Design a protein around this ligand. Structure first.
Ligand code: CHL
Ligand code: CHL
Ligand code: CHL
Ligand code: CHL
Ligand code: CLA
Ligand code: CLA
Ligand code: CLA
Ligand code: CLA
Ligand code: CLA
Ligand SMILES: CC1=C[C@H](O)CC(C)(C)[C@H]1/C=C/C(C)=C/C=C/C(C)=C/C=C/C=C(C)/C=C/C=C(\C)CCC1=C(C)C[C@H](O)CC1(C)C
Lengths: 201, 202, 201, 197
């Protein structure tokens, strides 16, 4: 069987708990899943390569002294911008991000006409043609690849929700919590931290 | 639509992408919730401009034991609210009058209690159009357009009240105080710098 | 004029605030209510009998030590544990609890075939084929008595939600809070607690 | 998919390794495993109740006397001893077990004669008192018992093996393994050399 975990994909079946009234939700959760996938991975990798929590990473790059993020990346012996130049600038990064992500979102969602000329209908979260340089979808199964991605989508969104509530409970960070739970499983869990009071009680 | 350009839409204008419109009672609830929110956000706006007390702390000034503090709080007042010598707006006094007046108005708004007026005023209609609009602004103005204006103000003010309650929970400083801090230096005074400070808990 | 209150029962009428959802919700609210009945009664009785909150009561039986719960039951002729060996140890109780409850839930919902084969159908709101040994309510106005328990379900669920929320607010316990209210409501209240700050502000 | 594990069940399909042509060993696997499941189960139960290993539990009893078990059981309302003597329990054990064997294999007459053929490993006519044999389909339930039978025979083999390597006891080996699985296993005990090297 395909998708036998719990419930069924939006493409086929009905939610056990929700009515699934609106068909905008399907692609919404695809996009949300993909973003979460990149977010969870980011939180996984940053705290490994740098040791900082993902939720306090924002404090390193601020409109004054954004140079803290420079050279934080593993390997990458050259910093983001040279030391002493002070060019890692929150506003410069923010403007570059605003223009790039805003243009990408406008192209995806039809706020602006697509720059390309080859199909790419607005609102489809599986474009394929331009977004498969390797040609893995035509070689593989399209439907089961889409199901795998969905499983990853929902798994990563649930992992992100876990990351934020772990951040709120323990105030430490995802990987450090994972390592504490691995080291002493009985003595590092949610009920253990509840016995400590979650840091406020 | 042409008239409603906001992200969402008005009930009857169409259907919302998220949580589409169900029962009409939901639309009545939205309008009334808006109306009370407009009143609430305006009160939280004007009171601490007049005297500086955040709305989430203004409750405790009046207490069953002592309620003198609420008297003479309104700026510009010619005299005390009740005798200067012995202010008599006691919390119980306030309650006993207000529960009766508000309960009456509510039951008479919804018609669970027989209407006093019986002027053709039909309960369960957000726009009574009777004595409530003596100016009859709706009669001169265009009623569809004006309904859209009312709902836009409803949603804006309900969102503003949500902002007021969450700002109270994060910064516990006060709405206009948060405004003045942000206008003072928005770059270094906003939600994310308060997050860096930790919202007062972390 | 049965159920002449704010709302209506799932069988007749429609939900005033929330969309009625599905039949799955209609069967599920009752089960949540039965569990909330048991939970609220357990919190009430454990606190009257022991004096320590239901929430903190989870720290009494830890993997390292479960002997604290040995002599907590009021009016017990002897402690359940021998007091001297600490035989519970949280592991026997955990394992037998998970097997018994998991089996019971599996048989309730037909995850596994029912063993009685007494004609009972899985997923029924009120099976009653062997869940009414006394028969006092089976014979005579069954529909009304379902309304009775329905009203108790919604109450116990609301009471549990209030229990968890004011546990969060005050961190003292439900009936400690109830005694504080009853002794002098006017100076010991939710709004008084908010003005002083529940545990914060 | 009934029994997707490696191999096949004796009733159908030739084994993947050891060919055979005798139904006697097909009978014998299931009885050897049943005896194992009782042995391995008692391994935990005893070792957890008394806190001693099963192989020293054997020599806990002496020919001269067997009083160590008195009040050794967990939660015993009264100790089994008030004659805590080995031979007293031995003659009764060997007689009861011997009779059971004779009755199950056909050396002596069956006491019930309820149609239980000694050749049959599944005389459910008098056995399965709950009646799960007829409550559910018998074939799958044969497989379930067999799987457990093989599981517990391998667990007994491994139990006795660990007994010989570490002598610390199966569940004590379990606790040591789950405590630090990286540096507590067969290969780190072989790095110590099982005590003999
Ligand atoms: C040859 C150069 C070089 C080498 C050996 C490494 C080596 C490594 N990098 Mg680095 N990186 C290098 C260049 C760069 N890295 C990064 C940005 C990153 C990221 C984003 C990540 C790594 C990660 C890793 C690890 C895999 C490993 C420690 C990954 C890791 O696991 O971090 C611990 C990871 O997620 N590197 C950039 C972009 C500025 C580089 C540009 O030159
Ligand atoms: C001579 C009389 C008189 C004068 C000049 C003012 C003047 C003022 N009042 Mg006061 N008030 C006066 C009498 C009274 N006021 C109030 C109740 C209020 C309220 C409720 C509010 C004011 C507000 C204001 C301010 C309007 C600024 C803007 O607009 C200003 C300081 C407003 C304010 O705070 O704006 C800053 C406001 O919201 N006054 C009452 C009823 C108790 C009065 C009775 O006579
Ligand atoms: C629409 C009605 C209404 C609303 C929304 C509020 C809202 C509030 N009052 Mg006010 N009040 C209201 C009517 C009235 N109050 C008072 C008198 C008081 C007093 C005496 C006190 C409050 C307090 C509070 C706060 C309670 C916060 C809380 O419980 O934790 C948070 C709850 C949530 C987030 C809900 C979920 C909040 C700002 C208390 C306070 O904050 O004191 C500083 C307090 O002590 N109010 C009177 C009678 C004269 C009212 C009459 O209707
Ligand atoms: C008041 C009665 C009573 C209580 C509370 C216990 C309590 C216990 N016994 Mg004991 N026993 C009791 C009576 C008896 N036990 C035994 C013989 C055993 C055995 C053979 C075993 C237990 C086991 C157990 C445990 C159950 C598994 C968890 C638990 C510690 C089991 C255990 O500890 O396994 C780890 C187990 O295997 N008990 C006999 C027969 C002499 C009893 C007769 O009354
Ligand atoms: C209590 C207030 C309230 C009520 C009853 C409604 C009701 C309605 N709105 Mg309106 N709306 C509100 C507030 C409200 N809205 C606000 C504040 C905004 C601005 C963000 C809007 C913006 C809006 C748009 C843009 C649209 C609607 C639409 C609708 C209809 C869709 C069905 C629905 O969502 O109902 C259920 C009612 C809800 C309020 C949804 C629940 C929201 C959840 C619970 C999140 C809220 C979190 C909460 C504030 C947490 C507080 C915690 C704090 C106390 C600590 C219905 C008539 C749609 C419509 O009519 O389309 C034809 C539509 O297009 N509304
Ligand atoms: C005081 C609370 C209360 C009341 C009066 C009833 C009353 C009734 N229930 Mg409900 N019920 C309750 C609590 C309550 N129940 C709780 C806590 C549980 C869980 C243990 C149940 C579990 C339950 C089941 C599983 C069934 C009932 C049945 C019944 C009937 C007997 C009667 C209508 C039976 C019934 O109506 O059979 C037709 C039935 O099948 N109820
Ligand atoms: C039927 C359920 C139920 C019952 C019997 C009680 C009963 C009680 N509550 Mg609890 N409570 C409930 C639901 C309930 N509450 C819910 C749903 C909430 C969350 C909104 C709370 C939050 C709450 C707090 C924070 C506090 C109490 C307190 C109290 C006690 C005094 C009443 C009071 O001041 O607050 C009554 C408030 C409510 C009933 C909330 C009503 C909100 C809905 C939306 C209307 C009393 C024992 C207080 C206490 O003992 O300390 C002095 C206290 O500090 N309760
Ligand atoms: C995993 C545990 C398990 C399972 C699933 C079964 C399952 C079964 N047993 Mg086996 N059995 C077990 C443990 C188990 N038994 C042990 C420990 C013993 C030794 C006491 C036996 C001794 C035994 C006998 C003597 C008989 C069964 C019978 C049965 C059947 C009905 C019950 C079924 C094949 C009966 C059967 O199959 O007859 C049709 C039958 O006669 N079994
Ligand atoms: C039911 C099967 C089973 C299980 C669950 C265990 C479980 C265990 N064994 Mg045992 N063991 C088994 C079968 C089993 N063994 C068999 C069949 C043998 C003989 C080949 C052994 C011989 C053995 C030795 C000699 C030692 C263990 C040890 C251990 C522990 C360390 C982790 C581990 O498994 O590595 C062991 C895994 C294997 C030996 C592989 C199993 C045999 C393959 C399939 C052939 C753990 C409690 C060690 C210990 O005491 O840890 C504290 C230890 O020193 N085992
Ligand atoms: C990497 C990085 C580094 C920096 O340090 C900081 C940083 C923040 C920038 C960060 C960047 C992160 C990013 C870009 C993240 C993007 C995240 C996103 C899109 C998250 C979405 C999260 C979604 C959630 C929770 C869903 C909850 C919904 C649930 C359970 C309902 C489930 C439900 C339904 C629907 C149907 C069933 O039948 C029944 C049930 C009830 C089960």
């Amino acid at each position: 069987d395909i998708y036998p975990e719990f419930g069924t994909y939006p493409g086929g079946g009905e939610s056990p708990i929700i009515p699934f009234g609106s068909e905008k939700n399907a692609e919404r959760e695809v996009i949300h899943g993909r973003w979460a996938m990149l977010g969870v991975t980011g939180a996984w990798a940053a705290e490994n390569g740098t040791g900082i929590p993902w939720f306090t990473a924002g404090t390193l790059c601020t409109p004054d002294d954004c140079t803290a993020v420079a050279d934080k990346f593993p390997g990458a012996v050259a910093p983001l911008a040279p030391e002493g130049s002070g060019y890692p600038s929150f506003w410069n990064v923010l403007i570059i991000e605003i223009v790039l992500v805003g243009a990408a979102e406008a192209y995806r969602t039809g706020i602006s006409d697509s720059p390309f000329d080859d199909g790419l209908t607005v609102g489809d979260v599986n474009p394929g043609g331009r977004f498969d340089p390797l040609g893995l979808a035509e070689s593989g199964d399209l439907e089961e690849l889409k199901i795998k991605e969905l499983k990853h989508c929902r798994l990563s969104m649930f992992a992100w929700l876990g990351c934020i509530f772990q951040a709120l409970a323990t105030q430490e960070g995802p990987i450090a919590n994972w390592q504490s739970h691995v080291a002493d499983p009985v003595h590092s869990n949610v009920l253990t931290n509840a016995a400590k009071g979650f840091g406020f009680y």
